[PDB]
Amino acid sequence: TGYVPEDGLTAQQLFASADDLTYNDFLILPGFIDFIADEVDLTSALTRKITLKTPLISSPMDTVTEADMAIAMALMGGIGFIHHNCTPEFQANEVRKVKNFEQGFITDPVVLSPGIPITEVGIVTSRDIDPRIELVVAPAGVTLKEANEILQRSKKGKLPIVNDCDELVRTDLKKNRDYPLASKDSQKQLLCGAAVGTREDDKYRLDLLTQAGVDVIVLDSSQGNSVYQIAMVHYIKQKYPHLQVIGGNVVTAAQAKNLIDAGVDGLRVGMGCGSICITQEVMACGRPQGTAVYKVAEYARRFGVPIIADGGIQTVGHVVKALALGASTVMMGSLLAATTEAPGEKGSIQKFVPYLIAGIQHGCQDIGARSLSVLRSMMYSGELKFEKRTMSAQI
Amino acid sequence: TGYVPEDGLTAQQLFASADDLTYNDFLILPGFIDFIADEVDLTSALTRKITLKTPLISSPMDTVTEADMAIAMALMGGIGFIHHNCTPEFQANEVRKVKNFEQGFITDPVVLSPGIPITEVGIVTSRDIDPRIELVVAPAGVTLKEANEILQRSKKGKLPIVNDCDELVRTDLKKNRDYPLASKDSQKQLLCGAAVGTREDDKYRLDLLTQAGVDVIVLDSSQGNSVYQIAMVHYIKQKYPHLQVIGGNVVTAAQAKNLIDAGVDGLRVGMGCGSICITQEVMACGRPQGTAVYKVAEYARRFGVPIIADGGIQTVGHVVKALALGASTVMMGSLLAATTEAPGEKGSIQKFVPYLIAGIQHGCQDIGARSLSVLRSMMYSGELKFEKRTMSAQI
Amino acid sequence: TGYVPEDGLTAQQLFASADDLTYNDFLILPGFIDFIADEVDLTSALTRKITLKTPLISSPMDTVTEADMAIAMALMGGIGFIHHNCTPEFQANEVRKVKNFEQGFITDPVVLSPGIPITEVGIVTSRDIDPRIELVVAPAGVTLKEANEILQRSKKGKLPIVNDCDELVRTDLKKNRDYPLASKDSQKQLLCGAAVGTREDDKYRLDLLTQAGVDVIVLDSSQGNSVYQIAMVHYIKQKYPHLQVIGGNVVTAAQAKNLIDAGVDGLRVGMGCGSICITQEVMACGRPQGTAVYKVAEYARRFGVPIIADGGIQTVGHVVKALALGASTVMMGSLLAATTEAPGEKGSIQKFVPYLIAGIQHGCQDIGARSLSVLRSMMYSGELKFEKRTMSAQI
Amino acid sequence: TGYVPEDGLTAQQLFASADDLTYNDFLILPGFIDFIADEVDLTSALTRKITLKTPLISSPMDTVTEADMAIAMALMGGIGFIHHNCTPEFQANEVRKVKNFEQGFITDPVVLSPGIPITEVGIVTSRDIDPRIELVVAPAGVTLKEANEILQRSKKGKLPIVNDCDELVRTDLKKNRDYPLASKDSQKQLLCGAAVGTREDDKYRLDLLTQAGVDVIVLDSSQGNSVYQIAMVHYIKQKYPHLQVIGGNVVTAAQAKNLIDAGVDGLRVGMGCGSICITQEVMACGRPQGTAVYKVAEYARRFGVPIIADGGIQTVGHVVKALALGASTVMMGSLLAATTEAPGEKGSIQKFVPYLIAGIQHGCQDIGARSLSVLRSMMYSGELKFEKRTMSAQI
């Protein structure tokens, strides 16, 4: 399957040359195809205990991931991490929105205020204002079929729901979408992630996120191999047994070692690649992303610790290379920054992610792998071949 | 002939370094000249049984090759492949035009319609319309000398020809061109190629092209090493014994092996180079063109299977490198996209191809080869020397 | 601390490849963090006997360093070298201004002229001119507390000071700044440097600078390994025992050897990098800065001779690389050319240098070093790891 | 002198890597200086029997060298080659102008025509036209002192000279320049070169140039290793024993071998570098200039055959590298294309060449060589050290 004469280079040869590699520094050599692209399985491990249908995860940047993005990202098979450039209460509240989502229901109903509902029974509709009104309600439990029917009868849009005197939640929907890849937890709620620092002060924020029901926590740092992060990992692993923890950014196996001994459930890899902020400029330390993912993933798989290729992704090709090199998932920031669901006053994630999924599936087919797992497997075993490009692209 | 002191690198050394090469990554070292450029023979094998006077072939792109291009390409020593971005009937009809061509005859005579001819005997000329007319005809067999004479007598442009009550075809010509390099089949008809997919649905299209008298068929694919293409090759080789088949794009010897065992008569090489379409974006798989041609040609010649260097050609220099590296012919798309004969509302192929021929001939002379065959031979034997350039061109 | 599996390359491996390196050609791999950035010590040796709190030194260019820059540079922990593109008297006078500085005192009081003071006792204020006046004075010794109080009483700005009939010097200040890193000599005066050529004619200029109390002298040259500079070093070392001498620019250990045997107290490294002048264009000789600093520093430390990385600095990252490679201090020109204190009709050095200090401190923390000395130590011992980038940056 | 610790690379190491080098691909490492730049001797061999004070030669391009350029080039220590993009008579006439030059004398006096002179005795001055006049003359032999004195007396500009009834030639000059480096032949005439093809037809042109007194002839070709050029070299060497011949462009030692066995007195090196013409586009053959000069010069010096580094020169640095690598002289085209003396409707060569001379002299001083000969010698012996740059310049 690999070759007859002289093919290209194995990953152990390529990443052993003398130069650190970038995603654009090489190409993967194609193989044998005996299946259709839609047969390729993209199931990926996000952490030791969390598995997703796709390997896509949105970055915890204030220009990328909030409730909007996380929900969309989760419905299409991935997951989003809520940025922490806000107050602990604000961030915790975004998580809450993600965990309470369910199509057909209004995310946040403006209940009373002294159309909106009364009795934090009545309603303050735009007509009785252009003073409350006796509104009609439906019994808790009603389905979207038993609701979008009751609504069509009385010619309405919203359907205030009641059962014990409080307002639990229904809206327009006459061709609802289906989400077969949706990332959900054991209770059928969408999965959500959130970023946090590693200072004592962050312990209060961690507490709110955990009460809000966050599933994964990523310790946001440009250099995660520190006594501070390690102690924070120990703490969480101790006080929140049901919370998965992804460890601060690292780019070498030596850094990975300390965080793994500490008990991280996953590693975020990258430094020097990806977007930049004035509050965090790049200095002398870093590492080409291709090499980083490979060298860290090679050591991490020894302990069953998944790796997230964070930064530098600009195309599907980049994604498939990151995965082929050992990463279990890929984190994207700027490539998603231009979607509808990204915070701020390329279309919707509902069209884009499916586009990336198809692309990755075609990437796998060209190399002859029926899944991303077979892929990493072909590379570790020396079957997968690559080819280095000269520093003057002409492909 | 090679050198006295220390020359450059042999092809087996150059393409064994550690990086895949592009046409712009190296230069060929000159040799000894004892002949004129016009003495260089460019005869090239397109497939196992088809030989052309020049190694030039036009690409099956809708912005490059249709009847127009194929005819021109064939008259100057090469061949064109009709794209398949159209209906099976349309494509089959383009082939037909190419196979029925003969200078001095109108390609497609608008016979009747109820100047054009009547009796799908008469004529509907622009005068009897500004209502048919009794037109004069000539006996089948008449030459262009016995026709362009009969025409000059009666002061006319077209000469309706008859023999058995139907209209077989003559037009203005008083200094007709001669085509000594013309690519023709055993019956003296111009050679024509056509592209097709590899799905069951394509079997109907293959049938029309074959009935239209196509000589070569290329299985259009970004990655030809698949059970689908292999089965399609087996099928054709079985049902159309007289049809030559060029196998889907490959870039490694391992891919070449499967298609050759299947029975292809030629291989189209390239992936990642050349033009791009939204319907086929480049992902993680591909290979620098220089290396691709060399590695595949080195394995293919073992079985007498010609190789077509497809993609990345921008100059004569590129063409000569592709050939020196082992390719038997070169496929060009965008470089021909700007010629008169290219579909759509740099001049004519009749001026351009002769320009490329002279260029290739001078390329051969500078290295001291009297033919493209001697060339590939000097490279395989280690006589031909090359020189690698640093990734910061300064030549 | 270095790594568990396969890290990157040691400095002895990286700078032993086959190519000379630039600061942008590689990255430093991060390590283990168990301290805060503000704990990092940046103490650096400028020469054998001069030590500064920061490793920053301004370049002797007429668009960069004069009295202004040198004072500012010295108050923030570094030092400046006064350019020599002026007369010996002018340059000597700039040094004098630097050595006589003390906050709260007017650098240069325009004493008389026949508000300014009289008696090279009285005053020519803008009122008695819009003719001298009997002005009030204060006893020598008075503090800024006993002065800025006497001033607030009589509602004035300047406070002419007297003791022996001459005017010694006070001005507005009600929130004076403190400078804990200030570079001062044994007498508590700010340290100052100055550039000079190596021709006999320069002996007169050296004499004025020394009488003006200069602490360090740098022999300005594009290629310092010459009998002229060597003889000039011998001369100074002989006639001015208390003057430190930095030797002309060199880029190889062989050049360094001659100047060290001659007795230089420090070496200025660089050639081909940094700004350019028509009066000194770059020819065929030079050396990539990264390699230059490393190779010269490796030989110089054997004799306790500090090295100044001169040229090519554009960012903090560049500074930290220069230091990690063996340089004791770094010389900056164009990066400071845009500050307020730079000669000519990015803000003040008082904001910028502190910005660089913090940056270097963070650079050290990321690699796990509590000081620049530990840093160079980790690199010489093989603990510090680097990673080479391909000539097509993608980080 | 070379180094103490680990310097850079010797030329035999650098040009033995695996890549062909360009002038911008490396730098020369500086050495020890114990002399002034004005002490550097630039004497260079143009061919086996022609020596010049400078190693500069102008290219035989129609936009660069004609009578004008050749004279100027010769007066400043170099030589020019007259292009052949003209008729044999025209080219021969340009040579004649160069050979007959002597300051103080009018190059081409418009003698009669039926101010100009009469008697192909009289004069047709602008006054007797705004009809000839009896003009006064001077005896042959008169000096510029005995002429520019006779002229100042009669208040005139031109001084018709006579001796045997014909007009031999004097003009304004009251501060004539001196040319200590002037390239002159055994008869004190300025040296001149001229280009010619290698076809039989060129034999007539060679004859005119030789009768015109040309000193050197260069066989203009993009690839000189041919039976045609070889036979032309044999012919000239046979029929014009006193004419020096420079052989067609080559870039390998193997090509050099044939032309040397044939008897060339010098080799013009280059292919792929330098200016381009539509009538001669670059194809697949060529070689980076740095490597070309080194590899050909290394073989040529074995037989005492000088080498001309032709093409790619853009700066003094390029010139000094070409010479250090083994070339005896350097040919410049476009760098001189913008001077006053270049044909067509940066100033004069009289200011520019002296500028290049000083630059080369400084180049030599920085490496510690008192002459270009010592230079090539330091490189062949392994003393001269170089340093390769990564394909992403940062110096």
In a nutshell, what does this entry contain?
Chains A, B, C, D: It catalyses: IMP + NAD(+) + H2O = XMP + NADH + H(+). Chain A is of the alpha/beta class and 395 residues long.
List the helices and strands and how they pair.
The structure is a homotetramer of 395-residue chains.
Chain A: H1 11-14, E1 26-28, E2 44-45, E3 51-52, E4 56-58, H2 67-75, E5 79-82, H3 88-99, E6 116-117, E7 123-124, E8 138-139, H4 150-154, E9 161-162, E10 193-196, H5 202-211, E11 216-219, H6 227-239, E12 244-250, H7 253-262, E13 266-269, H8 289-300, E14 307-310, H9 316-324, E15 329-332, H10 349-367, H11 372-380, E16 386-388
Parallel strand pairs in A: 4-5, 4-15, 5-10, 8-9, 10-11, 11-12, 12-13, 13-14, 14-15
Antiparallel strand pairs in A: 1-16, 2-3, 6-7
Helix pairs in contact in A: 2-3, 3-5, 7-8, 9-10
PDB class: oxidoreductase
Keywords: dehydrogenase, impd, impdh, guanine nucleotide synthesis, oxidoreductase
Assembly: tetrameric
